[PDB]
Amino acid sequence: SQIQFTRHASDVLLNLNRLRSRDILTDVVIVVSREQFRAHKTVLMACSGLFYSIFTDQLKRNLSVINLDPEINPEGFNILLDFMYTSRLNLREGNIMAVMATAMYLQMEHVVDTCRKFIKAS
Amino acid sequence: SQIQFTRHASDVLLNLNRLRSRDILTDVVIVVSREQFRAHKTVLMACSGLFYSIFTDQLKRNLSVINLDPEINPEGFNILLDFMYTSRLNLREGNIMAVMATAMYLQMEHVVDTCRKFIKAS
Ligand SMILES: CNC(=O)COc1cc2cc(Nc3nc(N4C[C@H](C)C[C@H](C)C4)ncc3Cl)ccc2n(C)c1=O
Ligand SMILES: CNC(=O)COc1cc2cc(Nc3nc(N4C[C@H](C)C[C@H](C)C4)ncc3Cl)ccc2n(C)c1=O
C-alpha cells in the first residue's frame, strides 16, 4: 500500500530545530518574565494546547509577540521548548515541580502524565 | 540524563498535517503546471534540498508563490508532498518513474535511494 519511513518524522523535527537555532522562518517571540524565546508558531500548536488555542484564533494568529504570565518559570518553559524540537525531556528532582506546573499551564497532558510517573517512581 | 519520547516526532508531523489540511499558518503556494498545493515553508525545507536552497535565500524567503517547472508531474509532487507530512510514500510500478524524477528535482536523496531499491527488488 505505502512504504513507511520510521526515522522521517525525527529527521523533520531535527531540521526544524536547526531552522529555530539559525532563526529561519521563526515568526513568534515568547516572553517569559524577562527571558525571550524565538520559535515557529506551527511547532508550538503541535506540542501545546495553550499555543494551539491561541494561534487557531484569527485575532491572535498574526501576533508576533506572545506575553506569558510572569509567574511562569523561565527554566521550566526552556526545558519544555527544547523538548518540543528534540523529543527529549530533561526531568530531574531539582526541576520536576517547575516543569510539571509549566506543562499544566501550556496544556501538555502527556508531559504532565510523565511528570506524574516520575515522582511515583522516584 | 534526558527522557526520550519515541512517538513525539510522529505526533508533531501528524499535527502539522492537520494544520496543512485546515490551512492554518500555510505561508506558501506551490504551482505545479496547473495544480496548486498549499504547505508550510519550514516543512518543505526539512524534507527537500531544493526548497531548503530557495527559502534560506533572503530574496526568495518571503515568496508567497513558488512556480515549479511545467515538466514536473503534478501526481509525482502530490505523492512527495503527502510523504513529507505523513512519512508514508506511495511507490508503485505505475508511478515509480514519476516519483523518482520529481524526487531528483526536489533533491530528496533518501527518496531517490528507496526508488533505486524499489525497481531493484521488483
Ligand atoms: C508529549 N506531548 C504532549 O504533551 C503534547 O500534548 C498536547 C498537544 C496538543 C496539541 C494540540 N494541537 C492540535 N490539535 C489538533 N486536534 C486536537 C485533537 C483533540 C483532535 C484532532 C482532530 C485535532 N489538531 C491540530 C493541532 Cl496543531 C492541541 C491540544 C494538545 N494537548 C491538549 C496536549 O496535551
Ligand atoms: C526521506 N527524506 C528525504 O529524502 C530528505 O532528503 C533531504 C532533505 C534535505 C533537507 C535539507 N534541509 C536542511 N538542511 C540542514 N542542514 C544540511 C546538512 C547537510 C548539514 C546540517 C548541519 C544542516 N539544516 C536544516 C535544513 Cl531545513 C537540506 C538538504 C536535504 N537533502 C539534500 C535531502 O536529500
UniProtKB/Swiss-Prot annotation, chains A, B:
It is found in: Nucleus. Changing N15K: Abolishes interaction with NCOR2 and HDAC2, no effect on interaction with CTBP1 and transcriptional autoinhibition. It comes from the Eukaryota. Residues 26-93 form the BTB domain. Induction: Down-regulated during maturation of dendritic cells by selective stimuli such as bacterial lipopolysaccharides (LPS), CD40LG and zymosan. Protein levels decreases upon genotoxic stress in a dose- and time-dependent way. Homodimer. Interacts (via BTB domain) with the corepressors BCOR, NCOR1 and SMRT/NCOR2; the interactions are direct. Forms preferably ternary complexes with BCOR and SMRT/NCOR2 on target gene promoters but, on enhancer elements, interacts with SMRT/NCOR2 and HDAC3 to repress proximal gene expression. Interacts with histone deacetylases HDAC2, HDAC5 and HDAC9 (via the catalytic domain). Interacts with ZBTB7 and BCL6B. Interacts with SCF(FBXO11) complex; the interaction is independent of phosphorylation and promotes ubiquitination. The BTB domain mediates homodimerization. Its dimer interface mediates peptide binding such as to corepressors BCOR and NCOR2. Interaction with corepressors through the BTB domain is needed to facilitate the rapid proliferation and survival of GC B-cells but is not involved in the T(FH) formation and BCL6-mediated suppression of T(H)2 and T(H)17 differentiationrequired for GC formation. Transcriptional repressor mainly required for germinal center (GC) formation and antibody affinity maturation which has different mechanisms of action specific to the lineage and biological functions. Forms complexes with different corepressors and histone deacetylases to repress the transcriptional expression of different subsets of target genes. Represses its target genes by binding directly to the DNA sequence 5'-TTCCTAGAA-3' (BCL6-binding site) or indirectly by repressing the transcriptional activity of transcription factors. This is B-cell lymphoma 6 protein. It comes from Homo sapiens. The gene is BCL6.
